[PDB]
Amino acid sequence: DDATASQRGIVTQVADTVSSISNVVDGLGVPLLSSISKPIGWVSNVVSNVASIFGF
Amino acid sequence: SVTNTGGLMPSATISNSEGATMLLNDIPDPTQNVFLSRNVTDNLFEVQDQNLIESLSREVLLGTGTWQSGQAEISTTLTEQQLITNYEQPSIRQISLPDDIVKGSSFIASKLANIAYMRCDYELYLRVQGSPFLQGLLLLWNKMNADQTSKIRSSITEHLRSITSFPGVTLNMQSDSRSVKLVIPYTSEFQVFNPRNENKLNSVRLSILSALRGPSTSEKATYSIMGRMTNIKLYGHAPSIVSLSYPQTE
């Protein structure tokens, strides 16, 4: 969500998500890497073959 | 929930395998600080999978050669001095089985390492080439177990009209495909054999049945033999060594 993150213009929000914590010891735990993942957003274009890829 | 005395009164009923072989008397303890993963994603072009039964069935070269007009054609008949002496009819090539393959192919020689015994069913492929103007006729045929019987009984059977009634296949050069297939069923007294000694039986042979001819003298044409196993059945586990016969003691 870098496009929105830059368009909105504020430093703080940096695209929210909520991770799935596990292995809690004393109220603290370790997030899964699987859910920390964030969208890349050019890949959809390359797979869908948007015109901009070809420069037109 | 009980202190483990150093070797006094262990459980006595435990049994579990480790490898595909080897049973074991007691369980290893799966304690360790971390459990890690495979790391790499594949990221590769696909390739066809490899299997053992599949690997054993692969085609193998067996022989290759020239064939030409000057070579002798098999006799219609026999005379005495050659009838008494167990004469054999002349041939371009002869091939033992299955040794030409198993002890003949280092690849197959390696795939069969440390297995005790096995069964096999052969296929053979003759492929001859020459010009349209050439004339000729070959025969590819299966002499049976032969060596396990009397010298006399593998002698009075070698003549043309008998040769043509054995299992086999002819090859005229008139054919455009110019290739033939021939199937050899397993056949022996013993139900299995270890690959790595002299388990020699059924001798395949190739024989001229009509002399090669062309407009000029001394024409020649090429040929190749190929073969592969099928219906294989491996059986048992053993050190890879030559075995011994009954009178001998090991």
Partner: protein, 203 residues
């Protein structure tokens, strides 16, 4: 579109002629007729040195990969001949990762081709690219065989049954591979490759 990479890849081109001879004392079986490293820009069978610079004559795809540093592809050959139907022989074609010399029928992927059954337009055949990672590197120093990570391997063509021919026909024939690069893909632009006009920097 005529500037798409797939459009460039899809055109076949002849690479080079190869004689097979040839009536009387035909070359003995196991005699190689061809060794073709799998890369569009190999210096061996493409191009020559001229003024220290190693120029490389070739098809447009070769330029397209000449510019990028990393690449990946599969091969699609089309074998083709100059023969009568009075010539008659057979051929082996192997695909060898990190190898050399002919390697039997068993050890590696192989593919016998009868000549007499090759009607014209020739015979298509495709090979997979086995390699330790996903991306090949392009440029190499080597003046003969491919270096190492520069190419997936080699394809090797050799006689199985030696050629025979009638007195009415010429002794030898000529094989002419045609080819195209399936699933080509390129990465990281930037290279020393450039057109052969001149041979110098201005000052």
């Amino acid at each position: 579109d005529e500037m798409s990479i797939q459009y460039l890849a899809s055109r076949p081109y002849m690479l080079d002629r190869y004689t097979i001879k040839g009536g009387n004392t035909p070359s003995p079986s196991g005699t190689v007729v061809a060794d073709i490293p799998i890369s569009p820009v190999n210096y061996s069978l493409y191009g020559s040195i001229i003024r220290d610079y190693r120029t490389i004559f070739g098809a447009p795809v070769s330029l397209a990969v000449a510019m990028a540093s990393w690449w990946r592809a599969k091969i699609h050959l089309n074998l083709q001949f100059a023969k009568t139907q009075y010539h008659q022989c057979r051929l082996l074609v192997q695909y060898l990762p990190y190898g050399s010399d002919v390697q039997s029928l068993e050890n590696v992927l192989s593919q016998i081709i009868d000549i007499s059954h090759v009607d014209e337009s020739g015979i298509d055949l495709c090979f997979p690219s086995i390699f330790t990672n996903k991306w090949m590197r392009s440029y190499d120093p080597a003046t003969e065989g491919y270096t190492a990570g520069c190419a997936p391997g080699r394809i090797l063509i050799s006689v199985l049954n030696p050629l025979i021919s009638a007195s009415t026909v010429n002794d030898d024939i000529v094989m002419m591979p045609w080819l195209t690069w399936e699933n080509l893909e390129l990465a990281e632009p930037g290279s020393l490759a450039k057109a052969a006009i001149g041979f110098d920097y201005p000052a």
